[PDB]
Design a protein around this ligand. Structure first.
Ligand SMILES: CCCCCCCCCCCCCCCCCC(=O)OC[C@H](CO[C@@H]1O[C@H](CO[C@H]2O[C@H](CO)[C@H](O)[C@H](O)[C@H]2O)[C@H](O)[C@H](O)[C@H]1O)OC(=O)CCCCCCCCCCCCCCCCC
Ligand code: CLA
Ligand code: CLA
Ligand code: CLA
Ligand code: CLA
Ligand code: CLA
Ligand SMILES: C=Cc1c(C)c2cc3nc(c4c5[nH]c(cc6nc(cc1[nH]2)C(C)=C6CC)c(C)c5C(=O)[C@@H]4C(=O)OC)[C@@H](CCC(=O)OC/C=C(\C)CCC[C@H](C)CCC[C@@H](C)CCCC(C)C)[C@@H]3C
Ligand SMILES: CCCCCCCCCCCCCCCC(=O)O[C@H](COC(=O)CCCCCCCCCCCC)CO[C@@H]1O[C@@H](CO)[C@H](O)[C@H](O)[C@@H]1O
Ligand SMILES: CCCCCCCCCCCCCCCC(=O)O[C@H](COC(=O)CCCCCCCCCCCC)CO[C@@H]1O[C@@H](CO)[C@H](O)[C@H](O)[C@@H]1O
Ligand SMILES: CC1=C(/C=C/C(C)=C/C=C\C(C)=C\C=C/C=C(C)/C=C/C=C(C)/C=C/C2=C(C)CCCC2(C)C)C(C)(C)CCC1
Ligand SMILES: CC1=C(\C=C/C(C)=C/C=C\C(C)=C\C=C\C=C(C)\C=C\C=C(C)\C=C\C2=C(C)CCCC2(C)C)C(C)(C)CCC1
Ligand code: OEC
Lengths: 485, 30, 64, 34, 28, 35, 37, 172, 340, 82, 57, 34
């Protein structure tokens, strides 16, 4: 077995059929996943139950590049009276599906029809491949198909722009983007720096292609690096795959215009930046500072936005064996309960110290501004000084669903402080899919975790294959006859 | 289940043990 | 070796096998594009890593 | 343009080069001397 | 103040009993 | 035989060797200090 | 369509599994519970 | 306690009653264990890294040895020529018997120590105590890394065997 | 051919081989091993962890280290001319500068050194199984010094170069991560243990198998170096285990390639799991458990016991461990058994 | 096998060595010891004099607050103690 | 019931249905360093409460 | 020509003696408990 797939190192006959297949199991898995993802993505709501909530791993990737309409009649937007044509999550899925059984079909040709004309080198009576040449055109091609990416697609000159949203998950929407190659054209967030990239390196990917197709491989390189041995190109690439691998699994973790929030999830660093908060709050401040009441203020801040400031939507809190869509964890987010401010007899506005990343558990501590401890639910009750009740705290909700109320009975208050440590409290439907109560990471995070072991494992034999490359001769064994050296 | 699932995978390692200390394929001396 | 329509039209593309060239010959022109590249990669690396703060370049979600 | 860290980045580039030019220029001195 | 002298003396004593024994030569 | 002293197997030695005899030397000062 | 020469026999010895059958079956026991969660 | 997790409990308790991670003994278990791992990789490495030539990927290379033969499938000096070349010579092993021994030398030597370490603390001669050690001029307490280690200890210290002792000092 | 002139010198069998690798391996592998020592004995981390590092501060060998930078930093590579120190060794020294440093140089030293194997074994002429065996280690370091940090909060939370420094790192993981319960790490263990077991099972399996192919009562003069064939009869030893522990070897060819696997293998395992800790995506809870625990004050498993430790080894820690997140912990609030 | 080995295995016994080295060792030892005995060390890496950790009074810790202007903090956080 | 207090902590399978969880629990302080020979427990059920199985093994 | 042996004893004191200063500075140093 350990060598059972070596039967192709030579004859690119039954070798293409291999690639022709893996690559039909890939798109074979394509749409099939979508029908699955598709067959369980409750679209009914995009504000408290976005695709990225109910773990959806393939869906998110479609939207980004365009397909956002579905033959069901909806859209990951909210809108109900549109519908792209055959290019709805339906066809998209269906598409690959046909492709697989389609590619499969041909994969056959190439095993039975292994001995092929152009398959061998003329001058000699044996099979071989002008690598530097095939690369020449494959490369070139890459470039041209690329190039047009920004050229029409991403720009719209011919196609759906791409998904782009403004600073806070809110108004995201698939839309054309015009390149911007000034400096900012290099901000992982500036969409234009991605449609200007793809026209750039595609154009260049082209030149290179032409050059590499024409010019010839300078000996001291073709003889230094054992090219001519299909082996070398498998290592000279494993390395490029793992290279980019590592970074894709870096974009998801770290803000990145290709990795929209509204599509995969919140940046772990969005609960670390306290981000959402400094905003939501500034909004309660401009609304409040103008003609409006504390009760009217938060009412402005919309669900979507409040929901984001919740920890349960921070991929940071998952766990390796939290088997599923975030929804199973804390429950199916139903509606926002409304920001709550805690006070006491005195009336000072206490503040609930929050729980950060690492901790799967925290102690509810209340510190007013300036940072002094003013109340806290005590594990040790006997020498309790700040304990609620004794300083008698009470919370009041402004905005949201629980709005306008003011709770006073310890038990409850205490309860809110607990659901306070998670940030903004919401009401979860746990019953439907029988939640468990153990918030799981998001796909935004998941992705990041496989371009892990898959990136890490990759590198390692870029060493092993890249070692079967330069050490062909040895392997079978080093020369049974050497002298002193 | 599980409780069983666990016992089995075990009552097996005991099998695969019996099989390697008695159905070991003799080391030949040539 | 079996004949093939599309096939005849594929090689020579496949034929020019050991199409080696004179000495390392074109190497320097190559490693001179890498010099520009390796720096390239590094220039963004340091912009992303928030060490290379450029004018009018806010590396945040707040781009638009 | 002309940021304090664009500058530091150039200065870093040369210092990088500085150690390349010197290490590499001293490597062939001893290269061909035996 | 410091008998750090005594310890070093006692020290140098036997590792240099060998010196003299090696400089006088004496089946060690 | 005909041996030299300014060999690489020397440069190496003096890379880590001398700073160290310096470091340990600096150390005694470290173990006097107080307050 | 003449038979294929690059078709060598598929190698595997009677204790090769005795090495693997262990590894996988034991590998199972560990990684199991984390499945039952 | 014999069972996966009980191990850990048993362990964590320990680390919290004996600074056993702050031991120049437990070091020696790691010291060697963290060695044998480092070395098993070598002799296993090099050895395999030096095999004659008996099949040419027709099948495998692990056949370059029919059992019983008095030859040595692997080449000794062909081997050393490498490690001697990796880290300067004199540093790589020349004699093969002085090699294999060294392989029981590393493990056993420290794995014993550890064995002693625990066996030592079963009498309360625990790992190093540097809590606060490092001081200030007026006297403020300047923190030693090992001071942190103290909290992650005091932490487990307090919680372990909760509600099982009614006094302030754990003498066991 | 000037290219061959440089080459020529370089790879010339000196006393301690230099090489092309030498231009990468050697420098980085210097300021790193170096830098460590430099800060180990002179620099304080007091402005990042308000704790003492260097030997100058009074610190002990064990209690010394080049502490990661303040989390306030992020992952900024703290260049010397980095906008952080703006170019200033003294400060750049204070802002922890040495960390990104030591780590990164060691990064390239570990690279340069793995390449240090591929070079030699290719000149001397041997299987690339040494360098290949170095994957185990590049993983471990890469997993626990770059990816971990990067996927987490700051460079801060990454290990810190020292003993007690990493010893911390350990407890840290046992606490908020409960690493000891991970399938992976429980394999790393498998490797680092067995590999050692092998290193010795075989070690002394040898010293006590070989023959009388020398005279005296000592084995050092015994045949070699590569002459007469084999010191230990793999047959006389064989039947020793096949009768004691039931099963023994055959073919030293594999026993030398299963000795490689074991550790280099298991060691890679953990390295994966560890990436998992980056996204806090770890193995902490056993659902089936907490739920059965929740509603029953009479069900206790070690698991729960261990699980309580964590809270302890966390509540008491974190505050004085994570200074930048101004922890304010009242005496009550803090969990802790009865009487202790 | 082949070895371009230089002296070494004896050069410690070297009569000239333990001479031009009965001058270099101690000349290196004290060289550093001064880097210490002076107090330079501190000023080099910034390490605090055991009196310059906390100011004579205040009990906070000069934790580097931000990331881009770090140095500045340190600056004022340094002059602090006075 | 390891530690003395009568608060049995039995990880196991036919209770602690898991492999990482369960294990063989120790003897109980109660009968400390004392030899608890299965044939002491006035009831095998007693020899059970008090970690008796541990020792023997 | 200095006795290769004495080259090893005079030095084996260098560590044996320096580590002795080291071990003292831990009972009165800056890193003392007082
Ligand atoms: C396994 C095989 C191993 C092979 C071994 C080979 C050895 C060779 C090693 C050589 C390379 C190592 C050196 C690379 C240094 C990279 C520097 C970096 O990290 O740079 C870091 C910074 C990232 O920016 C971060 O940004 C964060 C938040 O950003 C945002 O913060 C706010 C958002 O809330 C605002 O919007 C703000 O504007 C915005 O910047 C924080 O500020 C952080 O402090 C900051 O570091 O640059 C970035 O953009 C990051 C972009 C890097 C792309 C990803 C590469 C790194 C891979 C790790 C990522 C995966 C995660 C691990 C999970 C599991 C892995 C499997
Ligand atoms: C990328 C494409 C590619 C191709 C065509 C190959 C081909 C090969 N590799 Mg290989 N390899 C690759 C990528 C590839 N590798 C990558 C990215 C790595 C990580 C470094 C490796 C690491 C690696 C090692 C360590 C070894 C090989 C070996 C081999 C050869 C063994 C014979 C055979 O292939 O075994 C295939 C036979 C099998 C029975 C495969 C089943 C193995 C199971 C147990 C793995 C389970 C995975 C599967 C169920 C799901 C995988 C999905 C996921 C991996 C994406 C063969 C030439 C071996 C060598 O001897 O060369 C012959 C060898 O020791 N490879
Ligand atoms: C014929 C062209 C074509 C097109 C337009 C698509 C389009 C799509 N495929 Mg797809 N696919 C194709 C061929 C194509 N596929 C083939 C031949 C296979 C193998 C059978 C697949 C297997 C496949 C699977 C398994 C899946 C898809 C999916 C998708 C959809 C989302 C994936 C995506 O966004 O791309 C992302 C692609 C990129 C971002 C490009 C990355 C490639 C690297 C970065 C470029 C490397 C270039 C190289 C270095 C050369 C140098 C370049 C030079 C210029 C410098 C999207 C509709 C997904 C889906 O259906 O979800 C709805 C999905 O799960 N495809
Ligand atoms: C774990 C580290 C590691 C190791 C041991 C190897 C080993 C190997 N690689 Mg390789 N490689 C690596 C990482 C590694 N690689 C990475 C991260 C990439 C990204 C592309 C590659 C890409 C690559 C290609 C395309 C090829 C190889 C090949 C090889 C083999 C021979 C050539 C070679 O080694 O080049 C080693 C290359 C270097 C050591 C790079 C030089 C040092 C860099 C450029 C210094 C620049 C850093 C600079 C200071 C900037 C600062 C960074 C900043 C963030 C601080 C050999 C087995 C060849 C091969 O096996 O083909 C059959 C081959 O064609 N590699
Ligand atoms: C990456 C750099 C690095 C370095 C240099 C060290 C070094 C060390 N670690 Mg360590 N460690 C690391 C990363 C590192 N670690 C990481 C990432 C983790 C994850 C937790 C750990 C977890 C860990 C634990 C749990 C322990 C250590 C311990 C140790 C010490 C014991 C050495 C040993 O037993 O090896 C055996 C030797 C070899 C494998 C061959 C080389 C030996 C080294 C290189 C030389 C040691 C000599 C020393 C430097 C000075 C002696 C002078 C004399 C030899 C001339 C040693 C100082 C042990 C300790 O307590 O410290 C003493 C210990 O218990 N480490
Ligand atoms: C990686 C680069 C890339 C990728 C992944 C995509 C992906 C996509 N583009 Mg696109 N595009 C690109 C570059 C790319 N583009 C460039 C450079 C341009 C410049 C023109 C465009 C211009 C463009 C326009 C104008 C449009 C798109 C659209 C799309 C999407 C619809 C296609 C669909 O998903 O079915 C993919 C299905 C398959 C790949 C199936 C593969 C196998 C089947 C069987 C195909 C063949 C079946 C059968 C044999 C007959 C096929 C031919 C005939 C039937 C049509 C999405 C796939 C359309 C959009 O609306 O999509 C939602 C759209 O209108 N693009
Ligand atoms: C216990 C930890 C550990 C250490 C101490 C260690 C050390 C070493 N391993 C080496 C080799 C190997 N290790 C291997 C497998 C493994 N090694 C492992 C674990 C270790 N290996 C694990 C167990 C696997 C086995 C499962 C392979 C087989 C090799 C090699 O063949 C190689 C060897 O031949 O050794 C003889 C040597 C290569 C030297 C080098 O790369 O220099 C170049 C790098 C330098 C000089 C700069 C250091 C780079 C690092 C990143 C900088 C860190 C500096 C500080 C952190 C210093 C730490 C000290 C403080 C933290 C207290 C070196 C002595
Ligand atoms: C609840 C427990 C579950 C956990 C499992 C327990 C841990 C198992 C660790 C042992 C595995 C290492 C095997 C070494 C590989 C090898 O070398 O042994 C091979 C296979 O033997 C095996 O696999 C046999 C496995 C069963 C052995 C268990 C013994 C039971 C206890 C004995 C007590 C005696 C009083 C046989 O030979 C090998 O394979 C040969 C080809 O058949 C080749 O010659 C190879 O080079 C090699 O020699
Ligand atoms: C027989 C050998 C067999 C092999 C096993 C031997 C293992 C021995 C391990 C001992 C290591 C530490 C010793 C503690 C003594 C001590 O305490 O010295 C400390 C620094 O140590 C040190 O500087 C440790 C030196 C290790 C650095 C070596 C790294 C690589 C460089 C080598 C390159 C050479 C070319 C400084 O002491 C401090 O002294 C004062 C600070 O000046 C403080 O007040 C405290 O007293 C504090 O203890
Ligand atoms: C027939 C045909 C057709 C079609 C077909 C198709 C469409 C098919 C298919 C398909 C399919 C049916 C597919 C597939 C596949 C996929 C796959 C097969 C995948 C995979 C899997 C995997 C991959 C897995 C699993 C796992 C695990 C276990 C865990 C980890 C992860 C993983 C993934 C590894 C038509 C009529 C149209 C035409 C032609 C013919
Ligand atoms: C830093 C830096 C650099 C570099 C560096 C260096 C150069 C470092 C180093 C270094 C070093 C080089 C250090 C050192 C050292 C050492 C020491 C300080 C030591 C020691 C010790 C010891 C260790 C002793 C002893 C002993 C004994 C005898 C017993 C046991 C063992 C032992 C070994 C412990 C540069 C400028 C580039 C840049 C900046 C930064
Ligand atoms: Mn379990 Ca040794 Mn901590 Mn008292 Mn009991």
């Amino acid at each position: 077995w350990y060598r059972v797939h070596t039967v192709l190192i030579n004859d690119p006959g039954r070798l293409i059929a291999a690639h022709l297949m893996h690559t039909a199991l890939v798109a074979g898995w394509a749409g099939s996943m979508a029908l699955y993802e598709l067959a369980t993505f409750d679209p009914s709501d995009p504000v408290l139950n976005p695709m990225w909530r109910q773990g959806m791993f393939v869906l998110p990737f479609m939207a980004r590049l365009g397909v956002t309409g579905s033959w069901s009649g909806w859209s990951i937007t909210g809108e109900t009276g549109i519908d792209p044509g055959f290019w709805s999550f339906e066809g998209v899925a269906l598409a690959h599906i046909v492709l697989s059984g389609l590619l499969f079909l041909a994969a056959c040709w190439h095993w039975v029809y292994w001995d092929l004309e152009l398959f061998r080198d003329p001058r000699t009576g044996e099979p071989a491949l002008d690598l530097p040449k095939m690369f020449g055109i494959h490369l070139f091609l890459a470039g041209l198909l690329c190039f047009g990416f920004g050229a029409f697609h991403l720009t719209g000159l011919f196609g759906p722009g791409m998904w782009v949203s403004d600073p806070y998950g809110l108004t995201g929407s698939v839309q054309p983007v015009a390149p911007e190659w000034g400096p900012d054209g290099f901000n992982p967030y500036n969409p234009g720096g991605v449609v200007a990239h793809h026209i750039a390196a595609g154009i260049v990917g082209i030149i290179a292609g032409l050059f590499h197709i024409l010019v010839r491989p300078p000996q001291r390189l073709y003889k230094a690096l054992r090219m001519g041995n299909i082996e070398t190109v498998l290592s000279s690439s494993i390395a490029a795959v793992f290279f980019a691998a590592f970074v894709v699994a870096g974009t998801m973790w770290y803000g990145s215009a290709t990795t929209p929030i509204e599509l995969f999830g919140p940046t772990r660093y969005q609960w670390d930046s306290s981000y959402f908060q400094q905003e939501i709050n500034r909004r309660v401040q401009a609304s409040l500072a103008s003609g409006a009441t504390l009760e009217e203020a938060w009412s402005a801040i919309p669900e979507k936005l409040a929901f984001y400031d919740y920890i349960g939507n921070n991929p940071a809190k998952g766990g390796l064996f939290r088997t599923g869509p975030m929804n199973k964890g804390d429950g199916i987010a139903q509606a926002w309960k409304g920001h709550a401010v805690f006070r006491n007899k005195e009336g000072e506005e206490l503040f609930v110290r929050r729980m950060p990343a690492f901790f799967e558990s925290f102690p509810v501590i209340l510190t007013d501004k300036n940072g002094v401890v003013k109340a806290d639910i005590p594990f040790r009750r006997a020498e309790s000084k700040y304990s609620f009740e004794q300083q008698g705290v009470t919370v009041s909700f402004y905005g949201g669903e629980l709005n306008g109320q003011t709770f006073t009975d310890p038990p409850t208050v205490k309860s809110y402080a607990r659901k306070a440590i998670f940030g903004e409290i919401f009401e979860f439907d746990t019953e439907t899919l029988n939640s468990d109560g153990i918030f799981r990471t998001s796909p935004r995070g998941w992705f990041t975790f496989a371009h892990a072991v898959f990136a890490l494992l990759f590198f390692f034999g870029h060493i092993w294959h890249g070692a079967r490359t330069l050490f062909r001769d040895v392997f079978s064994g080093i020369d049974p006859e050497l002298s002193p050296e | 289940m599980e409780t069983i699932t666990y016992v089995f995978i075990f009552a097996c390692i005991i099998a695969l043990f019996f099989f390697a200390i008695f159905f070991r394929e003799p080391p030949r001396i040539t | 070796a079996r004949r093939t329509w599309l096939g005849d039209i594929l090689r020579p593309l496949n034929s020019e096998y050991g199409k080696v060239a004179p000495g390392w010959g074109t190497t320097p022109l190559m490693a001179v594009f890498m010099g520009l590249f390796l720096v390239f990669l590094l220039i963004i690396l340091e912009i992303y890593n928030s060490t290379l703060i450029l004018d009018g370049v806010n590396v945040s979600w707040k781009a638009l | 343009t002309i940021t304090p860290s664009l500058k530091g980045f150039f200065i870093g580039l040369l210092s990088g080069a500085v150690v390349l030019g010197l290490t590499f220029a001293v490597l062939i001195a001893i290269s061909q001397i035996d | 103040i410091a008998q750090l002298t005594m310890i070093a003396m006692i020290g140098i004593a036997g590792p240099m009993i060998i010196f003299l024994l090696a400089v006088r030569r004496g089946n060690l | 035989v005909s041996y030299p002293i300014f060999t690489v197997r020397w440069v190496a030695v003096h890379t880590l060797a001398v700073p160290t005899i310096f470091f340990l030397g600096a150390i005694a000062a470290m173990q006097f200090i107080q307050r | 369509m003449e038979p294929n020469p690059n078709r060598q026999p598929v190698e595997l010895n009677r204790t090769s599994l005795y090495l693997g059958l262990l590894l996988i079956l034991v590998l199972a026991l560990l990684f199991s519970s984390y499945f039952f969660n | 306690p014999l069972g996966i997790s009980g191990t850990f409990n048993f362990m964590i308790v320990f680390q919290a009653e004996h600074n056993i991670l702050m031991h120049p003994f437990h070091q020696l278990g790691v010291a060697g264990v963290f060695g044998g791992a480092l070395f098993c990789a070598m002799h296993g490495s090099l050895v395999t890294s030096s095999l004659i030539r008996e099949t040419t990927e027709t099948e495998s290379a692990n056949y370059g040895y029919k059992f019983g033969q008095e030859e040595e499938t692997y080449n000794i000096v062909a081997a050393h020529g490498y490690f001697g070349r990796l880290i300067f010579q004199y540093a790589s092993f020349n004699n093969s018997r002085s090699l294999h021994f060294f392989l029981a030398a590393w493990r056993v030597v420290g794995v014993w120590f550890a064995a002693l370490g625990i066996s030592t603390m079963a009498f309360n001669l625990n790992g190093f105590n540097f809590n606060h050690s490092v001081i200030d001029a007026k006297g403020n307490v300047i923190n030693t890394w090992a001071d942190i280690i103290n909290r992650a200890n005091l932490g487990m210290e307090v919680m372990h065997e909760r509600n099982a002792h009614n006094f302030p000092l754990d003498l066991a | 051919g000037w290219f061959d002139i440089l080459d020529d010198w370089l790879k010339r069998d000196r006393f301690v081989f230099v090489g092309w690798s030498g231009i990468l391996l050697f420098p980085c592998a210097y300021l790193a091993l170096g830098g460590w020592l430099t800060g180990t004995t002179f620099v304080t981390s007091w402005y990042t962890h308000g704790l003492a590092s260097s030997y100058l501060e009074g610190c002990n060998f064990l209690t010394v280290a080049v502490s990661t930078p303040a989390n306030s930093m992020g992952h900024s590579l703290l260049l010397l001319w980095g906008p952080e120190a703006q170019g200033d060794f003294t400060r750049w020294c204070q802002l922890g500068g040495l960390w990104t440093f030591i780590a990164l140089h060691g990064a390239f030293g570990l690279i340069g050194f793995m390449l240090r194997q591929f070079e030699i074994a290719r000149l001397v002429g041997v299987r690339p199984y040494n360098a290949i065996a170095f994957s185990a280690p590049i993983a471990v370091f890469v997993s626990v010094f770059l990816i971990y940090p990067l996927g987490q909060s700051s460079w801060f939370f990454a290990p810190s170069f020292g003993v007690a420094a990493i010893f911390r790192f350990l407890l840290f993981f046992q606490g908020f991560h409960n690493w000891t319960l991970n399938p992976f790490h429980m394999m790393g263990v498998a490797g680092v243990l067995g590999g050692a077991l092998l290193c010795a099972i075989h070690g002394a399996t040898v010293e006590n198998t070989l023959f009388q192919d020398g005279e005296g009562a000592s084995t050092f003069r015994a045949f070699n170096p590569t002459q007469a064939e084999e010191t230990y009869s793999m047959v006389t030893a064989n039947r020793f285990w096949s009768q004691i522990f039931g099963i023994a070897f055959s073919n030293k060819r594999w026993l030398h390639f299963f000795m490689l696997f074991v550790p280099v293998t298991g060691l890679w395992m953990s390295a994966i799991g560890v990436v998992g800790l980056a996204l806090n995506l770890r193995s902490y809870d056993f659902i089936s458990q907490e739920i059965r625990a929740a509603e029953d004050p009479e069900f206790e498993t070690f698991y729960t016991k261990n699980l309580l430790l964590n809270e302890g080894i966390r509540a008491w820690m974190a505050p004085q461990d994570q200074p930048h997140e101004n922890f304010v912990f009242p005496e009550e609030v803090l969990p802790r058994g009865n009487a202790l | 096998g082949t070895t371009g080995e230089r002296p070494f295995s004896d050069i410690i016994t070297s009569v000239r060595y333990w001479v031009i080295h009965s001058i270099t060792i101690p000349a290196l030892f004290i060289a550093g010891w001064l880097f210490v005995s002076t107090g330079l060390a501190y000023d080099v890496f910034g390490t605090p004099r055991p009196d310059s950790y906390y100011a004579q009074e205040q009990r906070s810790i000069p934790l580097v607050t931000d990331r881009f202007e770090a140095k500045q903090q340190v600056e004022t956080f340094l002059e602090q103690l006075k | 019931d390891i530690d003395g207090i009568r608060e049995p902590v039995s990880g196991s399978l036919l209770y602690g249905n898991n492999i990482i969880t369960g294990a063989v629990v120790p003897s109980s302080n109660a009968i400390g360093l004392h030899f608890y020979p299965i044939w002491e427990a006035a009831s095998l059920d007693e020899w059970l409460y008090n970690g008796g199985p541990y020792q023997l093994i | 020509r200095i006795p290769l042996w004495i080259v090893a004893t005079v030095a084996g004191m260098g560590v044996i003696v320096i580590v002795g200063l080291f071990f003292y500075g831990a009972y009165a140093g800056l890193g003392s408990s007082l």
